[PDB]
């Protein structure tokens, strides 16, 4: 058998593309925020780098 | 399929044991001290071979100046004076020349001394 | 089939040990022993049909006798199959594999030490390859 860790799916980590692991951008969630308007905006979609092998087998079938 | 150890282990052990000839005591009879003695014996065999080269070096030399001083010069001022006599180069085990023919080692003494003048 | 807890975790002076049923014991329990299992696996179809074709092909260096009917055996008796084969160079210095269709005709020699029978279908990249010659007979499977 082999589960997906459903902590991967609707969480960041899109699997997509030429096999590389996109993730999101994190801080200032909906926890409180004054702070800058150019950071409140720059929290869209990141993509990680040297951890991908771990992320992939979290969710190798792309759920 | 089972595949027990039989015949294998006795053969190995017997080859170790047979390496033990006049080993003292349980060195010759119990496998474990026989094999362990052989580990240290490995050490000794290799080191000694290299050393035996250097040991006969020493025996060589120790005869050569004994004859040299019998003719009134030491090793130092002799193997110098053959090499300073250049083409004279026989070098390897002059020991035996000094130890059997003295009529010859005397001529080599005269050659070395002539070269140092 | 053995027991419990054996004795003193500490203080007996004997070694540690826990029960009489472990591989370090000369009692019982093989650690990593055989257990019943299956080894059969679906080998890809293309390769086994290619296999029997190559096997029949390997006998076209020197081998493979007639695919057609050639049965002048008196209904079904071995001595007469031995004569039939003996006229074809099947004197039995070479083991030979026969394949056909008539129970009456393979029955002639299920006995002889050289030949062994197999019906149509049920051929074997191993069987035709392990006998020294192939009496292909049964022309029906041979041609399409």
């Amino acid at each position: 058998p082999k589960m997906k860790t459903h902590k991967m799916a609707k969480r960041r980590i899109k699997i997509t593309g030429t096999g590389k692991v996109m993730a999101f951008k994190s801080g200032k969630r909906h926890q409180n925020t004054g702070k800058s308007g150019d950071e409140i905006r720059g929290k869209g979609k990141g993509f990680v780098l040297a951890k991908a092998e771990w992320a992939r087998m979290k969710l190798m079938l792309p759920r | 399929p089972r595949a027990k150890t039989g015949i294998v282990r006795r053969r190995r052990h017997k080859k170790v044991l047979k390496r033990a000839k006049g080993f003292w005591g349980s060195r010759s009879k119990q496998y474990r001290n026989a094999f362990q003695t052989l580990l240290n014996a490995a050490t000794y065999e290799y080191r000694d071979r290299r050393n035996k080269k250097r040991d006969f070096r020493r025996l060589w030399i120790q005869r050569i100046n004994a004859g040299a001083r019998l003719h009134g010069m030491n090793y130092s001022t002799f193997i110098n004076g053959l090499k300073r006599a250049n083409i004279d180069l026989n070098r390897k085990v002059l020991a035996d020349i000094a130890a059997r023919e003295p009529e010859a080692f005397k001529a080599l003494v005269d050659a070395s001394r002539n070269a140092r003048q | 089939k053995t027991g419990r807890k054996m004795y003193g975790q500490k203080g007996t002076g004997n070694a540690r040990h826990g029960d009489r049923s472990v591989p370090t014991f000369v009692g019982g329990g093989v650690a990593f022993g055989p257990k019943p299992r299956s080894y059969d696996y679906t080998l890809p179809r293309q390769v086994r049909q290619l296999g029997l074709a190559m096997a029949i092909a390997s006998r076209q260096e020197g081998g493979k006798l007639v695919a057609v009917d050639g049965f002048d055996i008196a209904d079904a008796k071995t001595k007469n199959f031995i004569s039939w084969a003996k006229q074809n160079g099947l004197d039995g210095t070479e083991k030979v594999l026969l394949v056909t269709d008539d129970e009456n005709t393979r029955r002639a020699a299920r006995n002889v030490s050289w030949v062994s029978v197999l019906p149509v279908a049920g051929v074997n990249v191993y069987d035709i390859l392990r006998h020294d010659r192939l009496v292909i007979d049964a022309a029906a499977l041979e041609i399409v």
Partner: protein, 137 residues
């Protein structure tokens, strides 16, 4: 052929690792390192402080069309292909889904394919070359 003389392709079987079994390699400690939690085993892909927990934006469903890019479609030589002929001639594996086409380089000659729906710009390049396309009325 000689069964004595059968031989598997070189390099197609390599031998197992026999871990233990000598100081000629893989002595004492097995493949393993010495002490540490490396021993009779467990614990998975987890770092046991804080595992990079990023937040979760979520919507549960989906349902996607079966694809027929038309670049193979033009070299096809056979034309006017109703698509229930196509699943039962080649391509379109999916029985559970619906079919769609899309633009891939050219279109060229005439045809008439009855797919479940297709890109609007295929009609920009299928209508040219005198072709119909039936969305399933």
């Amino acid at each position: 052929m000689k069964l004595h003389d059968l031989k598997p392709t070189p390099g197609s079987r390599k031998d197992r690792k026999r871990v233990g079994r000598g100081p000629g390699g893989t002595d004492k400690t097995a493949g393993r390192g010495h002490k540490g939690q490396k021993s009779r085993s467990g614990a998975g892909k987890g770092a046991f402080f804080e595992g990079g927990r990023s937040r979760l934006i979520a919507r549960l469903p989906k349902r996607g069309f079966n694809n027929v890019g038309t670049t193979y479609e033009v070299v096809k030589l056979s034309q006017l292909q109703d698509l229930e002929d196509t699943t039962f001639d080649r391509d379109t594996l999916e029985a559970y889904r619906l079919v769609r086409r899309k633009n891939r380089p050219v279109k060229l000659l005439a045809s008439g394919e009855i797919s479940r729906a297709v890109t609007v710009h295929v009609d920009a390049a299928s209508a040219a070359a005198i072709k119909a396309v039936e969305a399933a009325g």
